[PDB]
């Protein structure tokens, strides 16, 4: 139910704002090139527009990450020293068909996500941010919806969006999300001269 | 469901692309100033971002209209003569709740937006609201809604200079189409009539 979930959303948003965050909102339209060669979100699983105006800008996003990188790139150019951002938004993919009886792509799928970015200088002298600050806010979001630290563990991930990342996975085996340090190649691509810590939480799993 | 909704959407999209339309996709983030003064989508009904980076771009859209107007204005001023656009997307708002919560209810709904602008697609003849009416009927028919199933009634919707509501025998609103307000197309520096339909996907099926 959209109204009940929205009430929980704003409660989590209140806590992030309290921790110093800004809310952002990015187009679900994105660049196909962002996804070339990824295994975490393959280019071939992208939902493409029909007869788009641009051949470059023609995919729906599979992750919230890149909209965030763009917003970071943009705001780092404008001299923001310290960026703590979050975004609620839907993501989209095709699932590959298991059998070769119809089409290469079977189901279309969408899912709700919370994206969280910390970059630059720590808000409290020369002190940079770290992934530990991100872990701490991630843990507190889980906490705000009644998920205790004993209910899940952090495991090393193999996610090529990241240089290194932990998956948050419940005692029951529900993937809750991922957080870590965005891969070197991806941050260079968006001309970010500095590390970016990103978490992406699966809202359906937290509800 | 999403996969099923998606399957019908593409069916309709094929028909639109077949009649010359490009699919577009705009941010659900929009400018509040677009909504000042409107009765149809009042500014105060907007779902707002919390502590946004911009005091101007801080609202979620209530209609698909303005993102299209942005898109049109962007492509016209780059010498397009003819623009036929459609977009699938959610819209957002608060409304009065059911008389035990003090809070307004958040609502979201899937919509189809259709814009026609410029020279009619193949003599040098302008496009017209009648082209859009035909398209709308052809979309309705594709999802199994015969012309006898609904009527057109004159609308009072300040997004439009003039517009028609599409409504079922029972009174269910299926959508709205018409000619965009003079003041709204001037505000986006479009120098030319824009014909816009907005269909309520949830009501069609």
Range of the domain at B59: 1-204
DSSP B45: G
- Rounded CA-CA distance B172/B140 in Å is 14
CB A56 within 8 A of CB A120: no
Strand partners, B115: B85, B196
- Rounded CA-CA distance A47/A74 in Å is 26
CB A177 within 8 A of CB A205: yes
Q: Count of CB contacts below 8 A, A vs B? A: 74
Q: Looking at the complex, does the CB of residue B3 fall below 8 Å from at least one CB of chain A?
A: yes
- B contacts of A23 (beta carbons < 8 Å): 49-52
Cα within 13 Å of Cα(B86), Cβ side: 25
Instruction: State the DSSP string of A5-54.
Output: HHHHHHHHHHHHHHTT-EE----SEE-GGGGTT-SSS-GGGPPBPSS-S-
- A contacts of B13 (beta carbons < 8 Å): 50
Q: Closest partner residue to B29 among A13, A25, A53, by Cβ?
A: A25
Experimental method: X-ray
CB A47 within 8 A of CB A90: no
- Rounded CA-CA distance B180/B172 in Å is 23
- φ/ψ (deg, to 5) at A109: -140, 145
- Rounded CA-CA distance A95/A106 in Å is 6
Count of domains forming chain B? 1
- Rounded CA-CA distance B70/B26 in Å is 9
- Rounded CA-CA distance B130/B135 in Å is 9
Whichever domain contains A27, its CATH number is: 3.30.930.10
- Rounded CA-CA distance B179/B193 in Å is 7
Report how far Cα B125 is from the mean position of its chain's Cα atoms: 24
- A contacts of B16 (beta carbons < 8 Å): 50
What's the reported resolution, in angstroms, to a tenth? 2.4
């Amino acid at each position: 139910n959209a109204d009940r979930r929205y009430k929980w959303q704003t409660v989590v948003s209140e806590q992030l704002v309290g921790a110093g965050f800004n809310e952002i909102l990015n187009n679900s339209l994105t660049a196909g090139s962002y996804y070339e060669g990824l295994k975490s979100h393959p280019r071939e699983m992208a939902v493409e527009l029909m007869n788009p105006l641009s051949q470059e800008l023609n995919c729906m996003r599979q992750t919230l990450l890149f909209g965030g990188l763009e917003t970071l790139s943009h705001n780092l150019r404008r001299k923001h020293l310290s960026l703590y951002l979050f975004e609620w938004g839907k993501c989209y993919r095709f699932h590959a068909a298991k059998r070769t009886d119809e089409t290469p792509l079977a189901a279309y799928a969408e899912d709700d996500r919370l994206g969280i970015w910390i970059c630059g200088q720590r808000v409290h002298p020369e002190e940079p941010t770290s992934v530990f600050e991100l872990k701490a806010v991630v843990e507190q979001v889980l906490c705000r919806v009644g998920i205790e630290t004993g209910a899940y563990t952090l495991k090393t991930a193999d996610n090529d969006l990241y240089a290194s990342a932990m998956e948050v996975k419940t005692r029951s085996g529900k993937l809750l999300g991922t957080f870590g340090t965005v891969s070197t190649e991806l941050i260079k691509r968006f001309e970010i001269e500095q590390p970016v810590y990103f978490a992406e939480l699966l809202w359906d799993a937290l509800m």
